[PDB]
């Protein structure tokens, strides 16, 4: 009944400013954030196949995990994902994509 059991994943930083999560029972490390540590925001973002990162000039690109495609402009799908604070569901739930 581990409903109130502390996670075995802890947070640490490397000399490069990077973060690595350690599992204190299995003794295994990862660069990926385990879904048990993911903050609500991350949980929200984590289901979005489109994610924001910046290029060398600071000009943003948005990448899709399913289709593996890259675009310069923000798709509306991500736009509504950001607005997950006012009108949580933008008239539809993310269970029907027309790509």
């Amino acid at each position: 009944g581990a409903m109130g059991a502390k996670s075995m994943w802890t947070e640490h930083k490397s000399p490069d400013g990077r973060t690595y999560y350690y599992n204190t029972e299995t003794k295994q490390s990862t660069w990926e954030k385990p879904d048990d540590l993911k903050t609500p925001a991350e949980q929200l973002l984590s289901k979005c196949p489109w994610k924001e990162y910046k290029s060398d000039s600071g000009k943003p690109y948005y990448y899709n995990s399913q289709t593996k495609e890259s675009r310069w402009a923000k798709p509306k799908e991500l736009e509504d994902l950001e607005g997950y604070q006012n009108t949580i569901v933008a008239g539809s739930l993310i269970t029907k994509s027309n790509l």
């Binding site: 640490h12 490397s14 990077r18 690595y20 350690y22 295994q28 490390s29 990862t30 660069w31 990926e32 990162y53 290029s55 060398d56 690109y61 990448y63 890259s70 675009r71 310069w72």
Partner: peptide, 27 residues
């Protein structure tokens, strides 16, 4: 080893270089 200090760093690396942006074709 590495029982003192900080625990070990994992194999692999989280995408250091940005995945390819469209260079110009149909975008």
């Amino acid at each position: 080893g590495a029982m003192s200090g900080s625990p070990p760093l994992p194999p692999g690396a989280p995408p250091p270089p940005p995945p390819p942006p469209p260079s110009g074709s149909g975008n």
